[PDB]
Amino acid sequence: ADTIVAVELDSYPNTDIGDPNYPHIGIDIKSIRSKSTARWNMQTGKVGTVHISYNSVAKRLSAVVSYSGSSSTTVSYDVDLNNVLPEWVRVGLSATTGLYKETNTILSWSFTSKLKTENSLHFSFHKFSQNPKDLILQGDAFTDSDGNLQLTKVSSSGDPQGSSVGRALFYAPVHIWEKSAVVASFDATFTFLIKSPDREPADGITFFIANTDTSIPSGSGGRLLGLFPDAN
Amino acid sequence: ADTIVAVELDSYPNTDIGDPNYPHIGIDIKSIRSKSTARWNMQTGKVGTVHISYNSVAKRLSAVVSYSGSSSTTVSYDVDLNNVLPEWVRVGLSATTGLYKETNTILSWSFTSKLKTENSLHFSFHKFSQNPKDLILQGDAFTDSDGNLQLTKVSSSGDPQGSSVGRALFYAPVHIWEKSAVVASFDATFTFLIKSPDREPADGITFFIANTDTSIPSGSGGRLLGLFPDAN
Amino acid sequence: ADTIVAVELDSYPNTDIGDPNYPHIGIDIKSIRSKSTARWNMQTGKVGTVHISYNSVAKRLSAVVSYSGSSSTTVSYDVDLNNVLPEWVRVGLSATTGLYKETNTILSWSFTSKLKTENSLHFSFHKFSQNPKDLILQGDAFTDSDGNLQLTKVSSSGDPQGSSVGRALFYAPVHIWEKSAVVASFDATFTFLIKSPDREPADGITFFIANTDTSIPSGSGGRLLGLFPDAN
Amino acid sequence: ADTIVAVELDSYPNTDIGDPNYPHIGIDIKSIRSKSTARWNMQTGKVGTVHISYNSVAKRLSAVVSYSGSSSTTVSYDVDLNNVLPEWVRVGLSATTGLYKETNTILSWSFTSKLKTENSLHFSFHKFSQNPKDLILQGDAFTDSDGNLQLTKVSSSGDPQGSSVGRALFYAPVHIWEKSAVVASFDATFTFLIKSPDREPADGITFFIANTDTSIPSGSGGRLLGLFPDAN
Ligand SMILES: OC[C@H]1O[C@H](Oc2c[nH]c3ccc(Br)c(Cl)c23)[C@@H](O)[C@@H](O)[C@@H]1O
Ligand SMILES: OC[C@H]1O[C@H](Oc2c[nH]c3ccc(Br)c(Cl)c23)[C@@H](O)[C@@H](O)[C@@H]1O
Ligand SMILES: OC[C@H]1O[C@H](Oc2c[nH]c3ccc(Br)c(Cl)c23)[C@@H](O)[C@@H](O)[C@@H]1O
Ligand SMILES: OC[C@H]1O[C@H](Oc2c[nH]c3ccc(Br)c(Cl)c23)[C@@H](O)[C@@H](O)[C@@H]1O
Ligand SMILES: [Ca+2]
Ligand SMILES: [Ca+2]
Ligand SMILES: [Ca+2]
Ligand SMILES: [Ca+2]
Ligand SMILES: [K+]
Ligand SMILES: [K+]
Ligand SMILES: [Mn+2]
Ligand SMILES: [Mn+2]
Ligand SMILES: [Mn+2]
Ligand SMILES: [Mn+2]
């Protein structure tokens, strides 16, 4: 099984497996049952931004989601990712639908990693090309004619579909820790557009970090957000 | 009085005003009496590195000090700087000597600030020029023919003197918060060389953030590290 | 007099002092009489982008102007800025109106300098605050409640006025060369909105580099773009 | 055959295939016969630095090599790499020995690419790990116990070998151009240590950019620097 760390923008409350009964942002450490969550005041049809950060000295993974003009929502969890993740990871975005549905559109994605022992990786996309050779598209993930990343299946009409799962990983492995290292830190930002006709959209989007050979686990659809085999 | 946030590398224990009884790294919020400290295994004569980071979501100010070879020391404190600091600041280094003394040599200094409402400021110095027009030098601070910044008095011969105070501020004010801000972060690194003829070197170095019109408070000498008017 | 290097977006042809007979992008070295120009297909009412770059090895200063959609214009000039500019500079934007007029609105501005002997300065503004303490505003320059920088007078109603000059300099001086330097580079981007009620808008916008104590030369109005004391 | 653009630090004069009769730096466009060169004042046993830059507006690929304290050497060539290279490339370093020999030690390597239509890639290594998962090592290339990259074969004693070729490519494809794009630019820096017992060291080191599936061509040893099948 993959080792997974994620920040979930969770649109659909699955109260039977630990979600609060509201759209929430959460921090997931090796389980879909977030270690910490916060009410997300969703706005179907607006562009949202997530920013995510961690460093190995503070040991505090935190995330904020916002929309232009709105109040933002934040969540944090104290954790030493050196004891959770392996030294080398791939970083990526995931998204699912299930019985309910939404567009999982990513308009932009940037990521920075630093390791001082200074080694660094940084990448930033404001367009996605039709053939993103520096992305590993998994599942139903694809790029569109506006240079956006659609993680889950959609018509060119506009209409999203159910039982869809797609991810996008940065092609290059990332070195997030080492024995020598004094500090390791990463920061990630993405902007996203969730539209739905459904009164109750589902399921959500994820930024995540995993072992390098990470793949969509089977039965990780809908509420497991493409990350987890089961809901332990 | 100035408003001060600082990370202090305090080479000299002043137990009568709250220092632990050993050299330590501290986080100072509006007082010399550090809110959080950790033991610092000084290595007079060797080049040390300090990394400092904060962001407004995690609300944790952290610092780590390290020498090439040995293990390193960290210190953290949970604080919302938006309730401590004005919206515009200057950032700087300070150092002092009192009755006991040491060189307070800065070999390099970098700083990055970000404000997402993205606005940003990054500066990096590896070589300090003979006339650093982008620094405000206060007190005894000067740059030397090696391209280092000496915060405290050092003779023609290279011997440190007591009763010295100096500071260097980046010339441009930094926007560290604003109302409509989603997240504010900053990171700082400097490297430093402390040499002493005294069996107990003193008094230390700080990275500090302050009101833009900050100046050396009179009687901030020695154990108050060029930051504070008294020891309250 | 000041020493000026500038990239001019010159909306108004002043053929009597060397402008070509159309709107143009120019590179100005110590004179309003551009050393190199190219035709600029203005689109009053649309958001334009300018990118400028130089480095001391290639010795080529280049600029490109672009609107989303249409094709773009470029201009270059081979010059060793180390023989033109002092070692320390300020960097800024200027704009003017004369008898004819336009809005000279800056929506964003970024600048990166590097000096390898690495020393560097990066600043980026997407939103200009109501009180930009890291800018020196000269002349009619001001920031507005949209978070834009208006270089020239614009009424309560949003109508531009003639006989306006304004400039904005980054507060910190920039080290663009030193003896022991291997390479010096700089890059600048700004975005801009020019609206005009006049059939011939005027006079234009510049990005400029100058002596640190640069100020608006009297009679630099209109066609001299807030940079030059005369048209020599 | 690969499409190759390179900057060669050429230690061994092969006058029969277009080299000047001296150690030189050159710019190679689809042939080992540099389009432009300049005398390199080699210093076997000192750390050298190369910096390389290009942008699509200026159309000037330039490189500078230097050592601490020395005079630097520079070379440039005007070229539009959009008409030479494909949209997607891998970037890398190469090195050979032949009958004569030298260490081809890389101590550091950084690279930045930007594409404005802003998309960007940046990576920086000051150590190389024992298993660099974000590098594609080709030929004899390997990382060592000091976290340096040895492009060509060496004893742990110190002693280099002949008939050696190795390269190192960044794992992620890089997008250096697109139809939409206004500007594309890249910058690269590496530091290097060439030691030799030979009175006449050979052959040299390269930074290069190629089609993504680039591989060491057979018979590209010694003077062809791992890049080219023949000396056309
Ligand atoms: O997309 C929303 C949800 O739809 C599915 O489950 C249900 C939500 N309401 C239901 C009603 C009936 C049945 Br059967 C099912 Cl599986 C569900 C599953 O795909 C869930 O994992 C998913 O979170
Ligand atoms: O430089 C180290 C310290 O030396 C001075 O105080 C003393 C340290 N040991 C002493 C012994 C005697 C006397 Br009097 C004094 Cl003031 C001190 C003062 O300058 C202190 O502020 C400073 O921290
Ligand atoms: O704003 C455009 C131009 O208007 C002014 O000059 C003239 C442009 N057309 C004219 C017609 C008549 C007279 Br008088 C004048 Cl000064 C001008 C002057 O302010 C020029 O410097 C400026 O470039
Ligand atoms: O490493 C230096 C050079 O050594 C080889 O060629 C010769 C240099 N001097 C010689 C003398 C004899 C013979 Br045979 C050869 Cl191939 C050479 C070849 O491997 C060249 O490609 C290479 O540049
Ligand atoms: Ca859910
Ligand atoms: Ca003390
Ligand atoms: Ca004009
Ligand atoms: Ca050769
Ligand atoms: K969890
Ligand atoms: K060539
Ligand atoms: Mn959830
Ligand atoms: Mn203390
Ligand atoms: Mn002109
Ligand atoms: Mn050659």
Coordinates of C-alpha atoms in Angstrom, one line a residue, chain D residues 5-103:
Chain D
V5 CA 22.6 22.5 -27.8
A6 CA 25.6 22.7 -25.5
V7 CA 28.1 24.9 -23.7
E8 CA 31.4 23.1 -23.7
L9 CA 34.3 23.7 -21.3
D10 CA 36.8 22.1 -23.7
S11 CA 40.1 21.3 -22.0
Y12 CA 41.8 19.5 -24.9
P13 CA 42.5 21.2 -28.3
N14 CA 41.4 19.0 -31.1
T15 CA 42.6 21.3 -33.9
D16 CA 41.6 18.8 -36.6
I17 CA 37.9 19.2 -35.9
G18 CA 37.7 23.0 -35.3
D19 CA 38.9 23.7 -31.8
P20 CA 41.3 26.6 -31.3
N21 CA 44.8 25.5 -30.2
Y22 CA 44.0 26.2 -26.5
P23 CA 41.6 25.2 -23.7
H24 CA 38.4 27.1 -24.6
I25 CA 34.8 27.6 -23.8
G26 CA 32.4 27.2 -26.7
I27 CA 28.7 27.2 -27.7
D28 CA 27.7 24.1 -29.7
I29 CA 24.5 24.1 -31.9
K30 CA 24.0 20.6 -33.3
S31 CA 27.7 20.0 -33.9
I32 CA 30.9 19.7 -31.8
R33 CA 32.4 22.4 -34.0
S34 CA 31.5 25.3 -31.7
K35 CA 29.7 28.3 -33.4
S36 CA 31.6 30.5 -31.0
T37 CA 34.6 30.0 -28.6
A38 CA 36.9 31.9 -26.3
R39 CA 40.2 31.2 -24.7
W40 CA 39.6 29.5 -21.3
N41 CA 42.4 30.1 -18.8
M42 CA 42.1 26.7 -17.2
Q43 CA 43.1 26.1 -13.6
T44 CA 43.5 22.4 -12.9
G45 CA 42.9 21.9 -9.2
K46 CA 40.7 25.0 -8.6
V47 CA 36.9 25.1 -8.3
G48 CA 35.4 26.8 -11.4
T49 CA 31.9 28.2 -11.9
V50 CA 30.0 28.4 -15.2
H51 CA 26.8 30.5 -15.6
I52 CA 24.7 30.1 -18.7
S53 CA 21.7 32.1 -19.9
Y54 CA 19.3 32.7 -22.8
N55 CA 16.0 34.3 -23.4
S56 CA 13.8 34.1 -26.5
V57 CA 13.5 37.9 -26.9
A58 CA 17.2 38.6 -26.9
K59 CA 18.1 35.4 -28.8
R60 CA 21.6 35.3 -27.3
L61 CA 23.0 32.3 -25.6
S62 CA 25.9 33.3 -23.4
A63 CA 28.2 31.7 -20.9
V64 CA 30.9 32.8 -18.5
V65 CA 33.4 30.7 -16.7
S66 CA 35.4 31.8 -13.7
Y67 CA 37.5 30.8 -10.6
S68 CA 37.8 32.7 -7.3
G69 CA 40.3 35.6 -7.8
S70 CA 40.8 35.1 -11.5
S71 CA 39.8 36.9 -14.7
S72 CA 36.7 35.3 -16.2
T73 CA 36.1 34.2 -19.8
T74 CA 32.8 34.7 -21.7
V75 CA 31.3 33.6 -25.0
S76 CA 28.0 34.3 -26.8
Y77 CA 26.2 33.4 -30.0
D78 CA 23.0 34.8 -31.4
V79 CA 20.5 32.1 -32.1
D80 CA 16.8 31.4 -31.8
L81 CA 16.6 28.0 -30.0
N82 CA 12.9 27.7 -30.9
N83 CA 14.1 26.9 -34.4
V84 CA 16.8 24.5 -33.1
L85 CA 15.3 22.6 -30.2
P86 CA 11.9 20.9 -29.8
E87 CA 9.3 22.3 -27.4
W88 CA 10.2 19.6 -24.8
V89 CA 13.8 18.8 -23.8
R90 CA 15.8 17.3 -21.0
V91 CA 18.7 19.3 -19.6
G92 CA 21.9 17.7 -18.4
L93 CA 25.7 17.7 -17.9
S94 CA 28.1 15.6 -19.9
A95 CA 31.9 14.8 -19.6
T96 CA 34.5 12.6 -21.4
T97 CA 38.0 11.5 -21.3
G98 CA 39.9 9.8 -24.1
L99 CA 43.6 9.2 -24.5
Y100 CA 44.2 12.0 -22.0
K101 CA 42.3 12.4 -18.8
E102 CA 41.0 14.5 -15.9
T103 CA 38.5 14.3 -13.1

